[PDB]
Design a protein around this ligand. Structure first.
Ligand SMILES: CCCCCCCCCCCCCCCCCC(=O)OC[C@H](COP(=O)([O-])OC[C@H](O)COP(=O)([O-])OC[C@H](COC(=O)CCCCCCCCCCCCCCCCC)OC(=O)CCCCCCCCCCCCCCCCC)OC(=O)CCCCCCCCCCCCCCCCC
Ligand SMILES: CCCCCCCCCCCCCCCCCC(=O)OC[C@H](COP(=O)([O-])OC[C@H](O)COP(=O)([O-])OC[C@H](COC(=O)CCCCCCCCCCCCCCCCC)OC(=O)CCCCCCCCCCCCCCCCC)OC(=O)CCCCCCCCCCCCCCCCC
Ligand SMILES: CCCCCCCCCCCCCCCCCC(=O)OC[C@H](COP(=O)([O-])OCC[N+](C)(C)C)OC(=O)CCCCCCCCCCCCCCCCC
Ligand SMILES: CCCCCCCCCCCCCCCCCC(=O)OC[C@H](COP(=O)(O)OCCN)OC(=O)CCCCCCCCCCCCCCCCC
Lengths: 57, 459
């Protein structure tokens, strides 16, 4: 009583019901480094300008 | 300071938009008006300097140098208009533009609050001076002269730049007003030794120090007359001004770093004055006398007492007026005989008596006749160096012998004796020439009435 599969059927992506748990860390990765702090706050003008040796702006 | 900078810049459209017959008259008139305006800088206080802005200030050191600088431009125009009479009109305007540009760089060299802006104006003065010497100097040697003047300066001044930027990284500022209160003592080390040399050797070249002086009897001799006037009267004093500002930061290491240079100056004024006894070129004699006079200013700044700084700034102003007048007198004889050989045209008092009186007064101020400000500066430096070490009076007093001897020899050779027979083109003195001599000599003698304005910040 076995029916041979049609062209296209064995290449389908199927769904599988398993009782084993999903691997939470399959790459066995350690903790990622903490990122650098982002920029935040309002952008105020430079205090007394460029401060390049004698320029006042 | 911008009430002086903007009219000095407005002299540029004034010279370039003037009618062709009016370019000496207009620039002379309005530079005299700027020079009259320069007396508002005499709002000086006993405690505070006159501090205009973040960029500019003027104490009692910079103020007489500014007044002398702004005064020297009309006198340079008067001195230069005769020998540039046959010049192309655009080259004549370019010459006047170089003088105006040099005044502009000088007046904000002396008022620069911050030391790297002082450096940039200080080195910016090189370019118009180099152009004036190499373009309007008379002889071949001007080209070689323009190299020496360029390369003794920069080889001294490029280590200064680095040194100043180091102070910028160490103190956080190069404001002289901030550095008056944040100056830290400079201890004995090799790092501070080469710090001292980098801070001092550019100004040692500008003074000039003896042994570093070789650019001057080429640069002042081969220059045209306005070039020699500004070189002897103002640009030597950039070194003394810069030392008086920079030695704030160099204590206490100066107390033994000054010892070689003081020797080089104390013996050097014996040498160069002696050199003036055997000079055949009159303009070279005046140049070597400038080296000898600036040796005293070097000693006075290095021993750094109140009397020595007062004597050094008085001697800088007095030498500016006297050496500029002496170059103008030598030029008035050069524009008749077309040779700078001093033994050539003799007996000129028989031919030119009022100009001989100007020669007499300029010689008397050169040998520091009291009560001239020449003698005030000379004498105050001698007092302070006697307090430094009592033996220096020997090298001081012997100098005052030789200074008298070359001053009158110059006066005896050119003015006295028998006139040269074959020279018959000795024209009577023009009104421009006597005017130039009087505009040197009358302010110089009037400053003896009130010398406190040329005694500097610690009068
Ligand atoms: C209500 C709405 C309307 C309001 C209107 C208000 C205004 C009304 C009047 C309109 C005109 C305003 C003009 C601008 C304001 C004044 C700016 C000024 O003078 O700054 C002082 C500035 C700093 O002085 P301050 O006392 O501290 O500040 C006073 C103010 O607060 C200065 O203010 P500040 O603190 O904000 O200044 C900012 C900063 C202040 O400066 C700094 O922070 C210090 C650094 C400055 C630069 C230093 C460079 C050093 C190396 C190069 C040297 C150049 C060679 C010299 C010139 C050669 C000849 C061309 O300036 C800069 O960074 C700009 C660079 C310098 C340019 C100045 C403006 C020039 C405009 C006209 C140009 C014409 C040719 C000028 C000559 C060319 C060279 C500049 O002075 C200098 O540095 C000395 C040089 C003088 C500058 C030029 C003077 C401008 C007027 C010239 C007219 C005549 C021209 C003659 C013909 C052409 C020449 C042959
Ligand atoms: C604020 C107001 C001030 C008012 C008072 C004035 C203060 C002094 C300012 C300067 C004065 C110099 C002007 C004359 C000399 C230059 C021109 C010349 O040679 O003309 C000859 C000519 C007459 O001769 P000439 O027969 O026709 O022809 C001459 C021959 O070719 C042949 O000529 P020569 O060789 O036979 O004759 C030249 C003769 C030659 O004699 C000498 O060379 C010997 C002089 C040295 C030994 C004697 C004096 C020693 C020191 C004592 C004096 C000072 C202290 C006195 C106080 C008591 C003690 C502490 O010199 C004199 O006789 C001049 C007398 C005054 C000499 C001053 C010292 C010069 C020596 C070197 C520097 C010494 C230290 C500085 C002293 C500064 C004092 C303020 O004179 C005039 O035409 C004079 C023109 C007008 C002069 C105006 C003077 C002031 C100008 C300032 C304008 C702005 C303020 C307004 C005040 C105006 C007041 C009227
Ligand atoms: C006109 C002709 C003669 C011109 C003479 C000009 C000055 C002569 C001395 C210049 C030395 C070099 C610049 C020094 C700047 C000082 C800045 C500073 O902080 O120094 C301390 C610093 C100290 O380093 P630091 O400050 O980074 O270290 C931190 C501080 N400690 C030391 C406590 C750890 O000195 C140096 O780094 C080196 C100084 C000596 C440099 C030697 C190389 C140059 C030799 C001289 C060349 C002179 C011109 C040659 C050409 C002649 C003509 C063709
Ligand atoms: C020719 C034209 C005319 C001249 C133009 C100007 C040129 C001269 C400019 C430099 C003048 C000489 C150098 C400055 C001398 C100041 C005092 C000094 O350094 O004394 C000599 C030094 C003494 O040793 P000491 O004091 O112990 O130094 C250790 C510091 N922690 O002695 C020693 O340590 C021995 C010597 C070591 C080598 C020094 C080389 C660098 C300095 C000269 C450049």
């Amino acid at each position: 009583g076995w029916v041979r599969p049609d062209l296209g059927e064995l290449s389908k992506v199927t769904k599988v019901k398993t009782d084993r748990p999903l691997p939470e860390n399959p790459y066995h990765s350690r903790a990622r480094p903490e990122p650098n702090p982002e920029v935040e706050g309002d952008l105020k003008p430079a205090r007394h300008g460029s401060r390049l040796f004698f320029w006042t702006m | 300071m911008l009430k002086y900078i903007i009219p000095t810049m407005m002299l540029m459209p004034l010279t370039w938009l003037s009618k062709n017959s009016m370019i000496w008259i207009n620039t002379t008139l309005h530079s005299l008006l700027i020079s009259l305006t320069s007396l508002l800088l005499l709002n000086q206080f006993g405690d505070n300097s006159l501090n205009f802005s973040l960029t500019f200030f003027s104490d009692s050191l910079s103020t007489p140098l500014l007044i002398l600088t702004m005064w020297l431009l009309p006198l340079m125009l008067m001195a230069s208009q005769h020998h540039l009479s046959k010049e192309n009109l655009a080259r004549k305007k370019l010459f006047i533009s170089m003088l105006i540009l040099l005044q502009l760089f000088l007046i904000m060299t002396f008022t620069a609050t911050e030391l790297i802006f002082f450096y940039i104006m200080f080195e910016a003065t090189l370019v118009p001076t180099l152009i004036i010497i190499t373009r309007w100097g008379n002889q071949t040697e001007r080209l070689n002269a323009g190299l020496y003047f360029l390369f003794y300066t920069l080889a001294g001044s490029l280590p200064l730049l680095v040194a100043l930027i180091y102070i910028q990284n160490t103190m956080g500022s190069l404001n002289f007003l901030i550095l008056q209160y944040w100056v830290q003592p400079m201890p004995n080390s090799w790092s501070n030794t080469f710090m001292w040399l980098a801070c001092m050797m550019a100004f040692m070249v500008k003074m000039p120090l003896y042994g570093l002086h070789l650019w001057l009897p080429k640069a002042h001799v081969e220059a045209p007359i306005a070039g020699s006037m500004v070189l002897a009267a103002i640009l030597l004093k950039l070194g003394g001004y810069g030392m008086m500002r920079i030695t704030l930061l160099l204590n206490p290491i100066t107390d033994f770093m000054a010892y070689p240079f003081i020797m080089l100056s104390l013996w050097g004024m014996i040498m160069t004055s002696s050199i003036c006894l055997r000079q055949t070129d009159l303009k070279s004699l005046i140049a070597y006398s400038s080296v000898s006079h600036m040796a005293l200013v070097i000693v006075a700044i290095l021993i750094q007492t109140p009397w020595s700084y007062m004597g050094a700034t008085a001697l800088m102003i007095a030498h500016g007026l006297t050496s500029s007048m002496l170059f103008c007198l030598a030029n008035s004889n050069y524009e008749r005989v077309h040779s700078r050989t001093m033994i050539l045209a003799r007996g000129l008092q028989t031919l030119l008596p009022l100009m001989a009186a100007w020669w007499l007064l300029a010689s008397l101020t050169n040998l520091a006749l009291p009560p001239s400000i020449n003698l005030i500066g000379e004498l105050f430096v001698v007092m302070s160096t006697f307090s430094w070490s009592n033996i220096t009076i020997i090298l001081m007093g012997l100098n005052m012998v030789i200074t008298a001897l070359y001053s009158l020899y110059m006066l005896i050779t050119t003015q006295r004796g028998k006139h040269t027979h074959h020279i018959n083109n000795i024209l009577p003195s023009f009104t421009r020439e006597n005017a130039l001599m009087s505009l040197h000599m009358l302010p110089l003698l009037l400053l003896s009435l009130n010398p406190k304005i040329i005694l500097g910040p610690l009068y």
